[PDB]
């Protein structure tokens, strides 16, 4: 009784993934399928920080503000 | 011998690609296996041989050749893309077999 | 003419199991100890890619000659993973199972990893993680594990996000050359005769030998995780730290889980022998879905509960359902529902091995776990040596350890563990 | 060594006994320890009337709420103090009582299906509980896209049959119908003539039958007005169904001919043109060296999510089809392969993907044949609809004496120029209409 | 072979006496050897030149 | 909005023909010839309708 | 050409044969028919009444 | 919410309200993934008609008279009801989230429950903060006076950044470490920062250096009011919390009256505090709080 | 900048006197120590790095080296990677 399906009797799909690289004869209940997913929006990279110099400064010290404008862009302070 | 290895490199001079700055295997005409071999290429390699094409292209549209010193040599000609071109022939031969029996 | 079942250790380690009942169709499994509690912090999701790259071009056959090869005979390869371990699967008739061995024992010994196989297959990775965390059980399953351990069994099945695009071919090839050494491997075969196994079995892996690299021992560290995400049900997994395989608390605590209830019996039943539909029934009338849940692995175990409920009354069916377990822990509990427990055990341990490829699973987790296949009338005595006490301190251990909680929904009102 | 010819043949073989009220007895023994023991009635929604759509459905549902002899849950406790695990299931033509237990409780299991069968006292309360209960599943289950889709197609290919109309019955029969008119579908549709009591595993035949002499003896035998239901053939009517939907993400299309039945052998023919064609979804780790053409087009063009094959058989009727579902771009492309794939199977069949289907062919029967429920479920099934369990080694006869030839005349028979039955559910504006659908049944070039 | 089509097209604008016929009928000869011919059998050869193949 | 050279369905024929085509840098002007063919077309079938008009 | 010399080509073109064939058949039919042909019209018998 | 998820710490600063509070706090300042596409028109009409009151808003104007503004306000802001909903308290539970992203920067907070706004503690723990570090006062320096990058700095060859965070609501109070370190070495950063507070909570501390830190406080208050736009928003905060406008000067007076046995009590309330742990980046050799 | 360089200090009024001096010792007694010079090249080199990845810093350098071009306006105020290696004191 060394198995998780042998031990786990409902939490077998749960706690083992199995996949297969060659189909069999016999097609597998809930075949399933990717609903089309959204895409993230495309930002410009912000620069790294590769000196201590840069990152002083970096670390929060006050509470989260946030802040839209009509014509302002919207920051956020730490 | 030595004597065919001679005329070869006549041959490579006669050519006239490496007046261009291009290997060998830029030269070569995209077919769908060099189209795949291509694009199994790493990024460095493929850098490499499209900044060639761009500089040769750009020496033909001024009609002009490189300075002799900066030409493609004969034995610094490095096949790239000769085993990849292998590796595509070699497995379209192998579906080819596979549709043929 | 059915045999017994006959073992081989190799010297070079690999264990080799054989059972030939003379089945139409033969399977032949290969078990390796390389699960995903094998990776750290910098190779997260290699195992993911490992089990969806079987179909790549080996040393031997291409993904071509080993697509068309195994379609050709209508045999099927499959690849299953658990958190400890791997298994490789081909099934087929007995006239083709030699190719089927050859396809088989070339993907576990001697893959490439070409750089643009694996590029292609990162997008299959995202849409069978995708496929995977379309139901919730799975997405809580794998929080909890998250949040109950520190290092090694807190490593998800599925790869992260953020790993998809970043997984190459040399984390692959570091992988199968740290964990897919003959030491950690057992070849089973039902249907097949013994010679032949062993034969192709020296011949293909006949150059890794060692013990590999071993894993960390997992730590535990309990918490909490809620994921609010609107759903109509909640979801929540309360667990605990319980026994690990090889000892006689995890038979106590498997007991325990079908005292409290692991599964129904009946289409559209009631559930009138589990302690914790009772319990929850006896109070609330909405619809749920109360059951007890034990995951145990070579060096640790998790046992809790785990309820499905509405989001108005996500609170107090959890703890009905956790009042039950200290009614457990209390003594409160009757011979007569111990042993409808242990006859719900060993006949769920019955109908798992009565099928083919549970009864392979079987043999190779026995064979990777000891080496020797243990006979199913010994683990029934052993289920019926379980006292009564046993399943009273495997309740008792459960209520007085730290909790690992998981929930999903609308967590509202659902309540915390300090609040327990 | 042993070849794959006596290894079928040293399978045991399925015995039959029949008492003396028609019942008929059937068990196959093997060296488990588990047995399933199943009662096969040969009872669906085809021999409802409408005025009865959703009887034998909420007779499956009131089924297992306790019996006369054992009054509601103290039934279920019974089944839960074995530890056996207790399963229904009801389709159009046959309905299925069975227990997975151990052999040891071989007696009272079956005494316990003799309740299930012939004593179940239906409640009012319990019926109206019964009833919310399928109000509540049927608005679960229309969520499911392709049982929705597959309704639509036996609605839509069986017009003004009894086969059009559903297992779960319309909504309003769910709220209309009470206990005398199940007292009458149980005392019209559940006679011993019309039932199958099925073992596999470790039973033995002589004990089974003692036991069937037992408790299910005398079950009805007799019509009691010698008023004789009749099944009655099922128009098929090439027609189409679209429920567009333009919110849903995905969209599920099935196209079928009408089959051939149980009883005809080219079934079997069928079933390997089906092994050609086959399966896919998006988890599968083909990739493009899928030896299916519809598979390997539909992963290089990006075009489906999914796709199956079926043929569903009943009595002398059948659905012989397939079924996809995709986003919308893509569906009329989906169509169009298809169709030509049914047509190169009319028309330009190979040995070699023959010898593969058969070979696939091979490999589903034997390892769906595989465990007591599914072995028991085949008894079932094999003594309602043939009369007989058709063996393994005939059915390799079978297989091995298809060869292109007849496949190719076979599938001309059943594909070529014929009106197939369409239903789609979601973004379907681009899945084409009926005439395109038609043209695309056969080819100007043949 | 652009040389040849000259002279066919030099061979066209004459009349049919000595040597303009076997002149004619050399030069359409080679215009076909060398279309059908020669210019694969060259490029075969500059491939094994160029170490291609 | 007022990129009508792209939005206009005549219009945006001959942008993707002659104004945004992409065409080879390195081109000779051997590849002017064809363009030619196309003018002397044109003037061939100007010249033969005015030679149309008595003929 | 040696891409088409196998036994599922021979397979295909044997299968292929009657069909074409027959599209012959046509085209020769259709010919003889539009081009009014006198070697052949001359010997099917209810065309000759109108020569 | 992608715009401002853009860099970590915002997240970071998320993570950390969720696991600290369990309600009427850890609610985002961001809209959650799910409640996209699901947020109606009628549901912030119930919010605006419950929390838009006459009782919860002042009116600051600067470059304007009283009469124009308090006839505004009459004959805009009388139709609405009174103080509206209450909230819940925010009640504390503490914990850890863990977000393994493999960010080449590993960005930790340990925080603790703290004083809240009016009480005087809370000034303390604001002298708290600029005894161990609240930011730069060099624009590329080494920050001398920071005890926390003097504790950190020592055993550290590669880039850091360690800070002390405050935060304080009208009925709760945050105060911690905030550490931005390499993925190898940010249990060492950690733990060298947790025991300059620890060595801090102990009375090992300069009279000298809490003058410094009073004087960074008054400082950074004076330069805080200096422009238009932060004066209005401290007299609009002072008017929201307080209902009074308090001059910076008795401001001032009350940060010079802080007691540095009150910083003293503050560390040993952040020290004896359960802890509250938001992390991300390679959390490999990152440790927990049980480990700490 | 360009065309400027500027160090200022923000403090309290009562401060004004040391603050000026402390200009007065920052713009006139400067001590360049030869270690800081390394240290500070290593710094520079990296921060170079850093601003490699800001596109529209990139941009802006672009602009000013193709828009003057030849004149001392091009170059940048951080110049180029091989003076940071080797300036001296
Ligand atoms: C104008 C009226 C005809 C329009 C086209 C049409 O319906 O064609 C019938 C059909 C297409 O219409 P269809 O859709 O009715 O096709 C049904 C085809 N079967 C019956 C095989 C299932 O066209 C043909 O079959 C080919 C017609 C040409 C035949 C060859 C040339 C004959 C004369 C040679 C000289
Ligand atoms: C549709 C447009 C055209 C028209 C209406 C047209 C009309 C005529 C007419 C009326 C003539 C007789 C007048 C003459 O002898 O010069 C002529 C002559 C001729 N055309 Fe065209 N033509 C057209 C296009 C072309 C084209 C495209 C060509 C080929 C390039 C062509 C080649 C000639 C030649 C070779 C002559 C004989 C010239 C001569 O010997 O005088 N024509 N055409």
Redesign the pocket.
């Known amino acids: 009784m060394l198995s998780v399906a042998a031990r786990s009797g409902p939490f077998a799909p749960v706690l083992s993934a199995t996949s297969r690289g060659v189909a069999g004869a016999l097609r597998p209940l809930l075949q399933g399928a990717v609903p089309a997913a959204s895409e993230p929006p495309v930002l410009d990279v912000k620069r790294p920080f590769l000196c201590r110099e840069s990152l002083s400064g970096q670390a929060a010290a006050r509470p989260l503000v946030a802040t839209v404008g009509l014509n302002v862009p919207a920051s956020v302070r730490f | 011998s030595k004597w065919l290895d001679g005329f070869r490199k006549w041959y490579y001079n006669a050519a006239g690609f490496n007046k261009l700055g291009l290997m060998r295997d830029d030269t070569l005409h995209e077919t769908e296996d060099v189209k795949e071999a291509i694009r199994r290429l790493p990024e460095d390699l493929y850098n490499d041989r499209m900044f060639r094409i761009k500089r040769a292209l750009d020496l033909t549209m001024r009609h002009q050749i490189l300075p002799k010193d900066q030409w493609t040599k004969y034995e610094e000609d490095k096949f790239y893309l000769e085993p990849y071109l292998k590796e595509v022939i070699r497995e379209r031969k192998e579906r080819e077999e596979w549709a043929k029996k | 003419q059915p045999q017994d079942l006959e073992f081989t250790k190799l010297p070079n380690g690999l264990v080799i199991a054989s059972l030939e009942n003379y089945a139409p169709l033969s399977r032949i499994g290969l078990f390796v100890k390389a699960g995903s509690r094998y990776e750290d912090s910098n190779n997260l999701g290699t195992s993911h890619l490992l089990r969806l790259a079987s179909s790549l071009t080996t040393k031997g056959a291409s993904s071509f000659k080993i697509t068309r090869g195994i379609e050709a005979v209508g045999g099927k390869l499959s690849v299953t993973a658990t958190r400890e371990n791997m298994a490789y699967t081909v099934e087929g008739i007995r006239s083709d199972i030699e190719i089927l061995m050859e396809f088989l024992l070339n993907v576990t010994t001697a893959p490439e990893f070409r750089r643009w196989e694996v590029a292609a297959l990162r997008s299959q990775l995202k849409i069978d993680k995708a496929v995977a965390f379309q139901n919730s059980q799975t997405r809580i399953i794998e929080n909890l594990h998250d949040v109950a351990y520190k290092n090694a069994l807190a490593n998800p099945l599925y790869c992260p996000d953020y790993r998809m695009g970043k997984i190459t071919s040399e984390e692959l090839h570091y992988f199968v050359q740290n964990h897919f050494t003959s030491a950690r491997m057992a070849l089973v075969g039902l249907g097949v005769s013994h010679s032949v196994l062993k034969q192709v079995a020296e011949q293909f892996l006949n150059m890794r030998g060692g013990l590999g690299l071993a894993g960390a021992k997992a730590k535990y560290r309990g918490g909490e995780i809620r994921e609010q995400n609107g759903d109509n049900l909640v979801h929540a997994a309360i667990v605990a730290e319980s026994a690990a395989i090889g000892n006689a608390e995890a038979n106590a605590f498997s007991v325990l889980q079908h005292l409290l209830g692991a599964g129904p019996h009946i289409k559209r039943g009631n559930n009138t022998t589990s302690l914790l539909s009772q319990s929850v029934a006896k109070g609330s009338h909405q619809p749920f879905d109360v059951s007890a849940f034990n995951a145990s692995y070579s060096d640790s175990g998790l046992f809790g509960i785990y309820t499905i409920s509405q989001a108005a009354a996500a609170g107090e069916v959890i703890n009905a359902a956790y009042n039950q377990v200290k009614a457990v822990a209390q003594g409160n509990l009757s011979s007569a529902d111990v042993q409808a427990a242990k006859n719900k055990l060993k006949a769920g341990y019955l109908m798992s091995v009565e099928t083919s490829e549970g009864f392979l699973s079987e043999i190779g987790s026995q064979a990777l776990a000891a080496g020797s296949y243990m006979p199913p009338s010994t683990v029934l005595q052993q289920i019926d040596s379980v006292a009564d006490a046993d399943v009273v301190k495997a309740a008792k251990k459960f209520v007085s350890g730290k909790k690992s909680m998981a929930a999903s929904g609308n967590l509202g009102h659902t309540p915390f563990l300090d609040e327990l | 060594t042993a070849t794959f010819a006596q290894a079928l043949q040293s399978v045991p073989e399925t015995q039959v006994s029949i008492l003396d009220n028609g019942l008929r007895v059937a068990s196959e023994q093997s060296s488990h320890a588990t047995c399933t023991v199943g009662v096969w009635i040969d009872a669906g929604s085809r021999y409802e009337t409408e005025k009865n759509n959703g009887a034998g459905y909420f007779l499956e549902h009131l089924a297992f709420k306790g019996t006369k002899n054992r009054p509601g849950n103290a039934l279920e406790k019974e089944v839960e103090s074995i530890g056996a695990h207790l399963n229904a299931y009801s389709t159009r033509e046959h309905t299925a009582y069975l227990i997975k237990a151990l052999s040891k409780d071989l007696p009272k299991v079956v005494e316990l299906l003799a309740d299930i069968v012939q004593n179940s006292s239906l409640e009012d309360s319990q019926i109206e509980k019964e009833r919310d209960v399928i109000l509540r599943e049927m608005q679960e289950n229309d969520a499911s896209m392709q049982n929705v889709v597959f309704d639509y197609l036996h609605a839509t290919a069986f017009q003004g049959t009894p086969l059009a109309q559903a297992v779960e019955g319309p909504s309003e029969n769910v709220r209309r119908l009470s206990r005398t008119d199940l007292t009458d579908y149980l005392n019209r549709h559940y006679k011993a003539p019309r039932m199958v009591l099925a073992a596999a595993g470790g039973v033995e035949h002589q004990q089974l039958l003692d036991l069937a002499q037992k408790h299910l003896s005398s079950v009805s035998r007799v019509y009691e007005e010698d008023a004789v239901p009749g099944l009655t053939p099922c128009r098929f009517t090439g027609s189409e169904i679209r429920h567009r939907d333009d919110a849903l993400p995905l969209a599920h299309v099935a196209i079928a001919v009408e089959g051939p039945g149980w009883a005809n052998p080219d079934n079997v023919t069928l079933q390997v043109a089906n092994a050609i064609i086959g399966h896919y979804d998006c988890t599968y780790g083909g990739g493009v060296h899928l030896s299916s053409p519809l598979a390997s087009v539909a992963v290089a063009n990006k075009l489906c999510q999914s796709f199956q094959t079926f043929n569903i058989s009943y009595s002398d009727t059948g659905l012989l089809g397939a079924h996809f579902v995709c986003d919308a771009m893509s569906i009329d492309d989906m169509v169009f392969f298809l169709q030509g794939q049914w047509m190169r199977l009319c028309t330009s069949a190979t040995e070699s993907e023959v010898t593969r289907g058969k070979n696939i062919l091979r490999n589903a029967l034997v390892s769906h044949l595989d465990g007591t429920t599914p072995v028991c479920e085949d008894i079932g099934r094999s003594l309602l609809t043939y009369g007989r369990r058709i063996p393994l080694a005939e059915w390799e006869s079978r297989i091995q004496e298809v060869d292109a030839q007849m496949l190719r005349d076979i599938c001309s028979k059943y594909f070529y120029?014929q009106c197939p039955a369409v239903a789609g559910y979601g973004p379907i504006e681009q899945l084409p209409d009926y005439n395109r659908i038609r043209?695309g049944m056969?080819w100007?070039r043949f | 072979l652009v040389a040849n089509l000259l002279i066919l097209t030099w061979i066209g604008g004459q009349p049919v006496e000595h040597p303009f016929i076997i002149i004619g009928q050399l030069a359409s000869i080679s215009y076909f050897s060398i279309i059908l011919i020669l210019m694969p059998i060259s490029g075969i050869i500059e491939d094994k030149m160029l170490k291609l193949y | 909005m007022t990129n009508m050279r792209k939005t206009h369905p005549l219009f945006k024929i001959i942008n993707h023909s002659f104004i945004d085509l992409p065409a080879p840098s390195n081109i000779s002007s051997w590849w002017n010839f064809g363009s030619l063919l196309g003018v002397c077309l044109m003037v061939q079938i100007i010249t033969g309708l005015f030679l149309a008009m008595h003929y | 050409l040696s891409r088409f010399l196998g036994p599922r080509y021979r397979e295909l073109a044997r299968n292929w044969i009657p069909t074409a064939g027959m599209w012959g058949t046509?085209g020769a039919?259709?010919?003889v028919?539009?081009t009014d042909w006198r070697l052949i019209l001359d010997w099917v018998p209810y065309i000759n009444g109108k020569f």
Do not use: P, T
């Open positions: 120029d043209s056969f100007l | 046509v039919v259709g010919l028919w539009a």
